[PDB]
Amino acid sequence: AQRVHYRRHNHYNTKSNKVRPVRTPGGKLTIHVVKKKAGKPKCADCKTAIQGVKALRPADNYRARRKNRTVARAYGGSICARCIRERIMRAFLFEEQKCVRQVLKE
Amino acid sequence: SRRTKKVGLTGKYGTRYGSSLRKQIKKIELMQHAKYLCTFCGKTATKRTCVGIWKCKKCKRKVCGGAWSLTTPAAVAAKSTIIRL
Amino acid sequence: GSIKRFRLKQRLGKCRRQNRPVPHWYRLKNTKRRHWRRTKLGL
Amino acid sequence: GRVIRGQRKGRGSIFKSHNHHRKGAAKLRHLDYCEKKGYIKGLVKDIIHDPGRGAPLAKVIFKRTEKYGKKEELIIASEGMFTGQYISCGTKAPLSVGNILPIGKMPEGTLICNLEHRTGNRGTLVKASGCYATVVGQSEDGKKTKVRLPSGAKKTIDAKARAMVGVVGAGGRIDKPILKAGVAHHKYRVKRNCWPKVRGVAMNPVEHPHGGGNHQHIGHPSTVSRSAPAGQKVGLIAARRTGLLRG
Amino acid sequence: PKQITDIRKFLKISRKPDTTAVIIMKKKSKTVITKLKLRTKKYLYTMVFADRKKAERIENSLLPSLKRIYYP
Amino acid sequence: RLYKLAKRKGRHMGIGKRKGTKNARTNQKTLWIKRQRVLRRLLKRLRDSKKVDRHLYHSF
RNA sequence: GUCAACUGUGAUUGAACAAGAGUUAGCCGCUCCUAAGGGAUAGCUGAAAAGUGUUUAAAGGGGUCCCCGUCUCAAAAGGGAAACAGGUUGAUAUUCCUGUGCCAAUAGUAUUAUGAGUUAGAUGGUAACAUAUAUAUAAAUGAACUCCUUUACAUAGGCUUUACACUCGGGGUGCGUUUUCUUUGCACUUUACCUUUAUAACAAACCUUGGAAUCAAUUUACUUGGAGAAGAGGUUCGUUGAACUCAAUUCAAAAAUUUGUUUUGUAGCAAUAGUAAUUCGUAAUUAUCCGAAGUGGUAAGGACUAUCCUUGAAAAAAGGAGGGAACGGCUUUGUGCUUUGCUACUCUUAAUACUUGUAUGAGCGUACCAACAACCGCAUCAGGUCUCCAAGGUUAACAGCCUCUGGUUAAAUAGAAAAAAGUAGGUAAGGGAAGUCGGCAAAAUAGAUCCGUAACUUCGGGAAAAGGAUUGGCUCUGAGGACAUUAAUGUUAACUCAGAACUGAAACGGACAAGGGGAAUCCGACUGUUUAAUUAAAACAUAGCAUUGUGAAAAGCCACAACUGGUAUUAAC
């Protein structure tokens, strides 16, 4: 084998300073600083990562197109589809229930 | 279970700390690590996630409770009293 | 250390320029010098 | 001599409280016109742990009465509170657990928590885990109300002042004994600079007045007057009775 | 660098005004195969032409203004 | 390579040559994991080929 | 270049002396953001000096006059857009050079091309969800006012995937051993960013169908299920980063578009560059460059699981959703606003031309050391001094021993002689603590595997108790996988275990590492801590027990000259 080092300093493996060793076309085993992996954006009520939305870091999410970011269906990446449905049912039925109360009262 | 004679779940403590304290710890830990029945979905998966908070895994929901068990006798009595009045 | 400050770098370059020996012609019409190992700039 | 540790504590320094883990001040809803005349219902959206407080905080959403949109409060979580629980606050609010009501509108012998010493002071009393106050009487011509502090003490406050139905969460916390010195360290790490708590009698008399003596004598009364100087107030100040409590 | 499958699109890219040069090279047996890489400022576009008949046809088809680069 | 040829023949190994524990020589958890995966693999193949029923599969 | 002095010896040497040379950045850092913090404004005190810091304010932003707002510095390891490969110098290189890219802005007006919409806002999919491939995935109406999310986070234990590393076996190249034996040993057989890289693959998540107790599916681990599981068929994310029909071509079939077969191609980058070569001298050519697999050492990710009377920063910045303000062009009355008459227009990227200050890329760092002499120690001081990179054999092993790459043979000196004495080491008959303050010193024990293990005990321990046995080398036997032919037969692998012979000076944990034990008394329970350079304990901490005071802004407890603070993001658990 051989030894290697960072070309950007910061040789300790921090949160941001992670590294992938790589062999070159020159046959030289070198080190490359690997891009920072992340957790995932979350549904508002359930805190659940959403289908159809890519998990891109905010620089890549700025460069990414709008089709990659979000879903046409209802309230997009805000809340998940099953969760939306139940909330819609609750909102409708409670208005119905309210209307029944109004009819009852007079 | 079929390992220790009397220390049971406090056998991890066994070589350290006073025996009576280990008895006291045993009672509290038995309550502490129990999996409670969930009022908000009917399964016995309700676990403590931090001191006052007992979360159901299945319906993903946080009930506020006692330190070592789901409910104090005091709170139950108070709840009952309010319904009574 | 390895990275530097513009003011410090300039003063150090000055001190180096001052360090170099006297013109020999001046004696035809050298009291102070520093050596890096035994005398530091004291900054 | 050299300044005693309790006197040194008030110089501020490294004896300021460890607030990093702590999620904000735990004061209740402020009094307003809507609370005064009627009631507001809110929804408990999340329950969160604070380690400076003995019990959880509850994140409660109200909708802005003077404007538009959703506003978040931090309430102390009552035992039996849950995420998605509806909490009601105000004069005309119904009696139920965790509701926030003027003490005048409690029936006697009820159990309550988060009392305030004056209206709109936002729950200054009865805040510790598992704790509760009892309403012990209501004035005949109103205006005042008599309540019982968790010390067992009775006190009379105005009827208008609010409190929160039920008992504080995380009860029975003191029942478990402290396992070990590391557990005690973890407790003080989120509290205050206050530990290890070394004996005064062990030290030089110069640096703690219980100190000195070749075989670690006290050599003087351990019962001190409240009239004493601060550097003399090391012992048991205003001690009416000493020895083991009996009867 | 970008591979372009469609010969007609490759010709269209050649006809585009930004494009300036043709880097063309013949490859030996492992029979002669020819790799043509075409130089636009945005990218260097590559087509691999299998045989001589393809290679002559592309070289003739390409605009004479384009700079033709041969390694020999 | 001569030593490895001996290891292939099983002959390089010797009882008093060992200085590591039985577990350090060959890990018990790993051996267990091999057996479980092979047994579960075997059961699934028997189920897939339908030579046993779900009841027998689950019990085994 | 060099030798007056220095380089504790010599000295032609030099980190000494003399003359020069040399560090090149839109992309690497700093620089930017906020934090723990610090400094102020607003106040208020104090003779002032100072002490404080939204706290009795007529104060930075967004909007057709209205709605919001204490400021400011503070991280060269937190957050934080964006660059790699090869080459090159006497000395630097992510920065010079060649090649390839990537990023942010990028004003006005007029042209053009690119797709939309019109005769004022696209589409598919039951659905989860998907859809613009223009040179270029550009462009998929939307104001106030709102709501989320990324930024953005603990520890422990296993499981798993990839990559680099390591090994074996085959073909190809050159060198090496070559008395004898060796179809042998060694070396080389290279491949990056970038292309929302395209696909394949898989752990997850979700959906349509489906409808389950005789519980099933199922992990090393338990998990999941009528609050809908198994099953069947999808979809998504994340890993990954040319895997796999992936692309082209071919012929056959589908069919008015899709599959099978052939021929090609390291997917572009990419061989021209690298390596081993081969010839030919002014420096140039030629030939070469790839088929299988195994070990599980690094590192990262993943799905998980468990623990806390402890639940594990923030903002700048970016993103998504809600909402429904606003709305063709020409001609024309009346007052930028309104009604009539007419129908190539309204958007949208990129390029171009023309004008408007000169319409692209700020500033700083980049040598060398990092101690084996460059820093601190009064000095080329066996001292101290942070972080990362981590080869082979032996082995549990990053140990110890030896080896390859890379490095070195300088240490403030050499030589000759060899006694005392010294110091660092060895070794010793017979006895075996009779020694001394005390077995101090030294020696004995020691690794694994197999047996066996007491008093006593808070029942957990004691415990590796005690005390035994075995261990080399060879030739065999057994146990433990993976694939495909209908129960048998084939193809085919890694190493570890267990047993048996034989063999030898019974020697064998061979060097190498490596518990002395027991019987008791006493103190401290314990893990912890301490007198920096004569002190680690029986002292201190510690849990546990008990005590006092205090219900609150006119409380407790403490600070400050004063005003004012701290406990307090507090409240008798």
Pairing, β B53-56 against β D40-48: unpaired
Closest by CA position to E69, among listed E44, E50, E43: E44
Q: What is the spatial distance between Cα D134 and Cα D151, in angstroms, rounded to a whole number?
A: 11
Contacts of D47 in chain B (CB under 8 A): 52-53, 62, 64
Q: Which two tokens stand for residue B32?
A: 């502490």
Q: What is the spatial distance between Cα A75 and Cα D211, in angstroms, rounded to a whole number?
A: 71
Closest by CA position to D160, among listed D145, D141, D148, D139: D145
Q: What is the spatial distance between Cα D60 and Cα D66, in angstroms, rounded to a whole number?
A: 18
Q: Do chain D and chain E touch with ≥3 beta carbon pairs under 8 Å?
A: no
Residue B48, strand partner residues: B54
Closest by CA position to D99, among listed D108, D109, D111: D111
Asked if D107 has any chain B CB less than 8 Å from its own CB, the reply is: yes
Q: What is the spatial distance between Cα B5 and Cα F26, in angstroms, rounded to a whole number?
A: 33
Q: What is the spatial distance between Cα A35 and Cα A4, in angstroms, rounded to a whole number?
A: 19
Alpha-carbon Rg for chain F, nearest whole angstrom, is: 19
Q: What is the spatial distance between Cα D49 and Cα D56, in angstroms, rounded to a whole number?
A: 4
Cβ atoms D166, B81 nearer than 8 A = no
Q: What is the spatial distance between Cα B54 and Cα B64, in angstroms, rounded to a whole number?
A: 6
Q: What b/e readout covers C29-40, taking b as 16+ CB neighbours within 10 angstroms? A: eeeeeeeeeeee
Q: What is the spatial distance between Cα B63 and Cα D59, in angstroms, rounded to a whole number?
A: 13
Q: What is the spatial distance between Cα D95 and Cα D115, in angstroms, rounded to a whole number?
A: 16
Q: N- to C-terminal Cα distance for chain A? A: 89
Q: Which two tokens stand for residue D60?
A: 């409660």
Cβ atoms A16, A9 nearer than 8 A = no
Residues 7-36 of B with CB under 8 A from D: 13, 16-17, 21, 24-25, 28
Is D16 part of any known ligand binding site? no
Peptide bond into D196 cis (omega under 30): yes
Q: What is the spatial distance between Cα D148 and Cα D144, in angstroms, rounded to a whole number?
A: 14
Contacts of B17 in chain D (CB under 8 A): 179-180
Question: Cβ-count burial of F46 within 10 angstroms (0-12 exposed, 13-18 middle, 19+ buried)?
Answer: middle
Q: Which two tokens stand for residue D5?
A: 């540790």
Pairing, β D154-158 against β D100-102: unpaired
Contacts of D110 in chain B (CB under 8 A): 81-82, 85
Pairing, β D100-102 against β D111-113: unpaired
Which resolution in angstroms does this entry have? Answer: 4.7
Q: What is the spatial distance between Cα F38 and Cα A91, in angstroms, rounded to a whole number?
A: 53
Cβ atoms D161, D100 nearer than 8 A = no
Q: What is the spatial distance between Cα D86 and Cα D42, in angstroms, rounded to a whole number?
A: 6
Q: N- to C-terminal Cα distance for chain F? A: 45
Q: What is the spatial distance between Cα E39 and Cα E16, in angstroms, rounded to a whole number?
A: 11
D3 contacts: CB under 8 Å, gap ≥ 6 = D231
Q: What is the spatial distance between Cα D51 and Cα D29, in angstroms, rounded to a whole number?
A: 21
Q: Output the CA–CA distances (angstroms, integers) from residue A21 to A6, A44, D188, D209, in the order listed.
A: 10, 39, 44, 65
Cβ atoms D85, D43 nearer than 8 A = yes
Distance from the Cα of B8 to chain D's closest Cα (Å) equals 17
Residues 161-180 of D with CB under 7 A from strand G: 170-180
Q: What b/e readout covers D13-45, taking b as 16+ CB neighbours within 10 angstroms? A: eeeeeeeeeebeebbbbebeeebeeebbebebe
Q: Which two tokens stand for residue F41?
A: 């693999």
